[PDB]
Scaffold this active site. Structure first.
Site, PDB file in Angstrom:
ATOM      1  N   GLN A  11      39.324  39.434  35.116  1.00 25.15           N
ATOM      2  CA  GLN A  11      40.652  40.198  34.866  1.00 25.15           C
ATOM      3  C   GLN A  11      39.985  42.017  34.935  1.00 25.15           C
ATOM      4  O   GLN A  11      40.519  42.828  35.396  1.00 25.15           O
ATOM      5  CB  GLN A  11      41.217  40.130  33.530  1.00 25.15           C
ATOM      6  CG  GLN A  11      42.082  41.350  33.098  1.00 25.15           C
ATOM      7  CD  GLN A  11      42.748  40.817  31.704  1.00 25.15           C
ATOM      8  OE1 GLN A  11      43.160  39.792  31.473  1.00 25.15           O
ATOM      9  NE2 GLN A  11      42.848  41.804  30.872  1.00 25.15           N
ATOM     10  N   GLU A  62      42.847  33.125  36.931  1.00 23.40           N
ATOM     11  CA  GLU A  62      44.337  33.158  36.448  1.00 23.40           C
ATOM     12  C   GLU A  62      45.085  33.881  37.367  1.00 23.40           C
ATOM     13  O   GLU A  62      44.578  35.102  37.686  1.00 23.40           O
ATOM     14  CB  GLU A  62      44.335  33.481  35.177  1.00 23.40           C
ATOM     15  CG  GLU A  62      45.371  33.056  34.254  1.00 23.40           C
ATOM     16  CD  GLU A  62      45.524  31.379  34.338  1.00 23.40           C
ATOM     17  OE1 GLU A  62      46.706  30.989  34.026  1.00 23.40           O
ATOM     18  OE2 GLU A  62      44.388  30.644  34.688  1.00 23.40           O
ATOM     19  N   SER A 131      32.728  41.806  34.127  1.00 19.20           N
ATOM     20  CA  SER A 131      32.537  42.292  32.681  1.00 19.20           C
ATOM     21  C   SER A 131      31.515  41.381  31.847  1.00 19.20           C
ATOM     22  O   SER A 131      31.514  40.048  32.312  1.00 19.20           O
ATOM     23  CB  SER A 131      33.908  42.177  31.725  1.00 19.20           C
ATOM     24  OG  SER A 131      34.787  41.006  32.340  1.00 19.20           O
ATOM     25  N   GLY A 135      35.089  35.061  30.128  1.00 14.96           N
ATOM     26  CA  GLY A 135      34.450  33.704  30.689  1.00 14.96           C
ATOM     27  C   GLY A 135      34.374  33.803  32.210  1.00 14.96           C
ATOM     28  O   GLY A 135      33.213  33.404  32.716  1.00 14.96           O
ATOM     29  N   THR A 136      35.453  34.325  32.761  1.00 15.38           N
ATOM     30  CA  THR A 136      35.172  34.451  34.480  1.00 15.38           C
ATOM     31  C   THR A 136      34.072  35.300  34.671  1.00 15.38           C
ATOM     32  O   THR A 136      33.132  35.078  35.509  1.00 15.38           O
ATOM     33  CB  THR A 136      36.480  34.688  35.018  1.00 15.38           C
ATOM     34  OG1 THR A 136      37.399  33.663  34.833  1.00 15.38           O
ATOM     35  CG2 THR A 136      36.200  34.982  36.471  1.00 15.38           C
ATOM     36  N   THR A 170      38.562  40.839  23.133  1.00 14.04           N
ATOM     37  CA  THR A 170      39.507  39.843  23.202  1.00 14.04           C
ATOM     38  C   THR A 170      39.102  38.461  22.854  1.00 14.04           C
ATOM     39  O   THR A 170      39.620  37.665  22.342  1.00 14.04           O
ATOM     40  CB  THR A 170      39.957  39.558  24.675  1.00 14.04           C
ATOM     41  OG1 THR A 170      38.824  39.200  25.409  1.00 14.04           O
ATOM     42  CG2 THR A 170      40.500  40.665  25.344  1.00 14.04           C
ATOM     43  N   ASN A 219      40.450  52.355  32.757  1.00 13.54           N
ATOM     44  CA  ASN A 219      40.192  52.061  34.116  1.00 13.54           C
ATOM     45  C   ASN A 219      40.237  53.268  35.085  1.00 13.54           C
ATOM     46  O   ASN A 219      39.410  53.478  35.909  1.00 13.54           O
ATOM     47  CB  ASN A 219      41.377  51.109  34.623  1.00 13.54           C
ATOM     48  CG  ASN A 219      41.154  49.645  34.241  1.00 13.54           C
ATOM     49  OD1 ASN A 219      40.711  48.995  34.938  1.00 13.54           O
ATOM     50  ND2 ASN A 219      41.417  49.530  32.804  1.00 13.54           N
ATOM     51  N   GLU A 245      17.677  52.340  48.591  1.00 11.02           N
ATOM     52  CA  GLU A 245      17.127  53.785  48.084  1.00 11.02           C
ATOM     53  C   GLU A 245      17.731  53.703  46.468  1.00 11.02           C
ATOM     54  O   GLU A 245      17.133  54.356  45.754  1.00 11.02           O
ATOM     55  CB  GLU A 245      17.992  54.963  48.810  1.00 11.02           C
ATOM     56  CG  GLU A 245      17.419  56.140  48.688  1.00 11.02           C
ATOM     57  CD  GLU A 245      16.228  56.366  49.523  1.00 11.02           C
ATOM     58  OE1 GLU A 245      16.515  56.180  50.644  1.00 11.02           O
ATOM     59  OE2 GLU A 245      15.108  56.614  49.149  1.00 11.02           O
TER      60      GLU A 245
END
Ligand code: GTP
Ligand code: GDP
Ligand code: MG
EC number: 3.6.5.-
Lengths: 427, 415
Positions: A11, A62, A131, A135-136, A170, A219, A245
């Site tokens: 996400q 997801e 991130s 989990g992902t 989260t 973001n 480099e």
């Protein structure tokens, strides 16, 4: 001609990639459909009709995040085959996204990445966005890195990882995933750019005057920063012209590849009445701790290398004067085993901001990437949170019961222990 | 992405009907199953609890008393459920756990399993089950736990959740209550991932003392149960980042495999943000009838609903965490998670819900133990169980495992 492939995982990775690629489209002039009425090919590919297709692979377990892009404003920019998705997510569990759930989709993701790579001619490497607390973004990212190092062994694998913060956290097991993925990616990656969420949150509250910042503002700022970093690879500059480099300039040793990033200036949209900042003011603001992306105290630590990247109305002689002024401060201490000297690359392209955003356009801007030991202060903060939990084996069963051995919890931690020592010996 | 909801026994059906009614009123679905709301936020994730064909609940209705069919069908939302999902037997179990677990439950369990399979196999991606029932009956307490055993033997990878209610002397005062409660806890300990320990003692205390109802009927308790269910499911019903699915909730709130018994709380009981935050942690609003200040919270989830300043919510959360830092464990960093939703519940312009995994819940497990012991030393009515195929070694194991769970909670309390 050499090109780069972006990989967005999870996400956070996909949502940062949306803002990043939107900003790239505004910068280069590419319309949302891919029509653009040079080095920009480093991130785009040309079709027969002239449509520019990004070399971006969006990976998630997801469909909620990816389907925001498959039907969003840029829904026609990316081919549907580049936006990979599964039905089952990792549920804030590194083991799920690494050993069982991510193993179901890793072959498909690798096949897609190979398809994009075959369309290239002089590929440099991959810029993987993810991130730490997810989990992902922690499990599948590390699995994908371990898979890519066997196939694309010679290609640099940079990272843009999102350091967890309690204000927007989260899950409570974020330190577990942060340590676990760091252990299994510390060898395959070669220059990881980390961003702390709480630093962005504080900057948004202070500079942009937002009472309760959301992922949109964070973001947007992170997309600004990533664009400032990659402008050297996109606009045919004189510094950081390749991915190797980056390792040469910022990573003297293989295990200390964690540069610290600073961006200036951050100005709210309503504060455009301000006079434009000089080169000296932004150069000084580079070293302040109000503009850092990973909060720490670099004045305590010892710099290894420092690359400054300017943009906008910037004069080389003013940069040289700023360098001369800066090099006469006692708080800037370099390691004696590295040559003491800054690296400056100036780009003349004005910075670009998203219209309707909270960041006002500026006549000039600066991005400072310094390899310093004080960044280890951000590592210890993780380990403490690890040690408070693994001492009672809290939430450990969630990982062992899903195909991962318990002994990997200690080993990973032990690795970071050495990592911490790696900064104490050097400094 | 979808949740199959099961409800067994008289209490299970009478709380689940209120749950479905209240969440349908929140979503905008009328008694005919047709959407009549005003926002797309109401139907962003309505497929979690409903099937589109008109929206139909995923409810599976189970009982051993046929009358509870009509009692649910005569309700305002009795005609929206699938008529094929009503699986109600003829010979009732009464108040005996062994009857609902070995003789009468084991006869209907095959049909209920087939119905559950038919409902679950239609899901594109089933995420888990929930099951509303009672630990004080014979049909719910036994047959639901047998159903959970079968489901976990059939769907090992799916999260299994329950909304169990435990009996209280002031509500029913039946002499066989602790046997059913103990034997049901003995099964929920090993074969469940999440449990919301609702207490009839807490509901009666709230209705009598705070609400000033002289003789609170079952409707008064069921209203509070429905509010609790709505508050604890508003995260899974509406889009958000906290507790997105059942497995994320379990990973967030369950530190240890057996410590998965939760303490609900709701506010206000029937007014600004600080008053909500003070009342939400307060012991008078707990639905498990235990003092949260007796033990230490392991994990806490605070879900606010309505139009409030989210800055004020965060500031009040930090202020409470600083003032009450003596009651949160220091070995679980950042264990209090706050979520905010802009859709208020039915009849409340502003609301708050608290879900707390705390060691003080062992207090409740002490009561069920004590009431058990007072009638297990003399073998008060054990011959009602061995005549159904049960054995007393099961009673001893149930008591031993409940006591071991109490000991584990106490160990992690003073740790
Ligand atoms: N700045 C910023 N941080 C984000 C964003 N999305 C997620 N995060 C951070 O990432 C952390 C969770 O990691 P995610 O990458 O979102 O996890 P995931 O990719 O959904 O994978 P799962 O853990 O399986 O759900 C949160 O604590 C957030 O702080 C974003 O859009 N912007
Ligand atoms: N709060 C509440 N508790 C109930 C209700 N109905 C039954 N109970 C409790 O459940 C116990 C009776 O179990 P019951 O569900 O009737 O047995 P079963 O239907 O055969 O499984 C009693 O001790 C009550 O305290 C209700 O509507 N509300
Ligand atoms: Mg996700």
């Amino acid at each position: 001609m050499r090109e780069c492939i972006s990989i967005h995982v999870g996400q956070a990775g996909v949502q940062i990639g949306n803002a990043c690629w939107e900003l790239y489209c505004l910068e280069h002039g590419i319309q949302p459909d891919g029509q653009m009425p040079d080095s920009f090919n480093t991130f785009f590919s040309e079709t027969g009709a002239g449509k520019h297709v990004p070399r971006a692979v969006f990976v998630d377990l997801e469909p909620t995040v990816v389907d925001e892009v498959r039907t969003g404003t840029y829904r026609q920019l990316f081919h549907p085959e580049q936006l990979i998705t599964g039905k089952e997510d990792a549920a804030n569990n590194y083991a799920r996204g690494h050993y069982t759930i991510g193993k179901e989709i890793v072959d498909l993701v690798l096949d897609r990445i190979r398809k994009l790579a075959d369309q290239c001619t002089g590929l440099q490497g991959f810029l993987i966005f993810h991130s730490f607390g997810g989990g992902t973004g922690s499990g599948f990212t590390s699995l994908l890195m371990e898979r890519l190092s066997v196939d694309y062994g010679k290609k640099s694998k940079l990272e843009f990882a999102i350091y967890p913060a309690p204000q927007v956290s989260t899950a409570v097991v974020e330190p577990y995933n942060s340590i676990l993925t760091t252990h299994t990616t510390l060898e395959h990656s070669d220059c990881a750019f980390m961003v702390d969420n709480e630093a962005i949150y504080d900057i948004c509250r202070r500079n942009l005057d937002i009472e309760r910042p959301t992922y949109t503002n964070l973001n947007r700022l992170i997309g600004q920063i990533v664009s400032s970093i990659t402008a050297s690879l996109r606009f045919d500059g004189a510094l950081n012209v390749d991915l190797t480099e980056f390792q040469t300039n910022l990573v003297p040793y293989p295990r200390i590849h964690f540069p610290l990033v600073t961006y200036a200036p951050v100005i709210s949209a309503e504060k455009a009445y301000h006079e434009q900042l000089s080169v000296a003011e932004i150069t000084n603001a580079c070293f302040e701790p109000a503009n850092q992306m990973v909060k720490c105290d670099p004045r305590h630590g010892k710099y290894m290398a420092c690359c400054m990247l300017y943009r906008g109305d910037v004069v080389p002689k003013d940069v040289n004067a700023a360098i001369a002024t800066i090099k006469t401060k006692r708080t800037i201490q370099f390691v004696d085993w590295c040559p003491t000297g800054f690296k400056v690359g100036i780009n003349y392209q004005p910075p670009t901001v998203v219209p309707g955003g909270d960041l006002a356009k500026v006549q000039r801007a600066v991005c400072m990437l310094s390899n310093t030991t004080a960044i280890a202060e951000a590592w210890a903060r993780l380990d403490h949170k690890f040690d408070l939990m693994y001492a009672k084996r809290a939430f450990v069963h969630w990982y062992v019961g899903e195909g991962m051995e318990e002994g990997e919890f200690s080993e990973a931690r032990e690795d970071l222990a050495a990592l911490e020592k790696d900064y104490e010996e050097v400094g | 992405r979808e949740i199959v909801h099961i409800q067994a026994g008289q209490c299970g059906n009478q709380i689940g009907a209120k749950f479905w009614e209240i969440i349908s009123d929140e979503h905008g679905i009328d008694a005919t199953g047709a959407y009549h709301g005003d926002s797309d936020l109401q139907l962003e994730r309505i497929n979690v609890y409903y099937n589109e064909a008109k929206y139909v609940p995923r409810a599976v209705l189970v009982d051993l008393e046929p009358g509870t069919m009509d009692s649910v069908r005569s309700g305002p939302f009795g005609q929206i459920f699938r008529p094929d999902n009503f699986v109600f037997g003829q010979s009732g179990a009464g108040n005996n756990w062994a009857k609902g677990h070995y003789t009468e439950g084991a006869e209907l369990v095959d049909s209920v399993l087939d119905v559950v399979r038919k409902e679950a196999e239609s899901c594109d991606c089933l995420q888990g089950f929930q099951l509303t029932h009672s630990l004080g009956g014979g049909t719910g307490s036994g047959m639901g736990t047998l159903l959970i055993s079968k489901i976990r033997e059939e769907y090992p990878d799916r999260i299994m959740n329950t909304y169990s209610v435990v009996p209280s002397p002031k509500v029913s005062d039946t002499v066989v209550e602790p046997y059913n409660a103990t034997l049901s806890v003995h099964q929920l300990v090993e074969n469940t991932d999440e449990t919301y320990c609702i207490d009839n003692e807490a509901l009666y205390d709230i209705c009598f003392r705070t609400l000033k109802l002289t003789t609170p009927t079952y409707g008064d308790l069921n209203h509070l149960v429905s509010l609790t269910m709505s508050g604890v499911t508003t995260c899974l019903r509406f889009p958000g980042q906290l507790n997105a699915d059942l497995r994320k909730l379990a990973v967030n709130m369950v530190p240890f495999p057996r410590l998965h018994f939760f303490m609900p709380g709701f506010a206000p009981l029937t007014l600004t943000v600080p008053e909500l935050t003070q009342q939400m942690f307060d012991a008078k609003n707990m639905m498990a009838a235990c003092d949260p200040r007796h033990g230490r919270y392991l994990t806490v989830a605070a879900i606010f609903r309505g139009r409030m300043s989210m800055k004020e919510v965060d500031e009040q959360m930090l202020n409470i965490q600083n003032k009450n830092s003596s009651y949160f464990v220091e070995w679980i960093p950042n264990n209090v998670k706050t979520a905010v939703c802009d859709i208020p519940p039915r009849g409340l312009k502003m609301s708050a819900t608290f879900i707390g995994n705390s060691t003080a819940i062992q207090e409740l497990f002490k009561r069920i133990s004590e009431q058990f012991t007072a009638m297990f030393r003399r073998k008060a009515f054990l011959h009602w169980y061995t005549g159904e195929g049960m054995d007393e070694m099961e009673f001893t194991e149930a008591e031993s495992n409940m006591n071991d769970l109490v000991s584990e909670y106490q160990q992690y309390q003073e740790a």
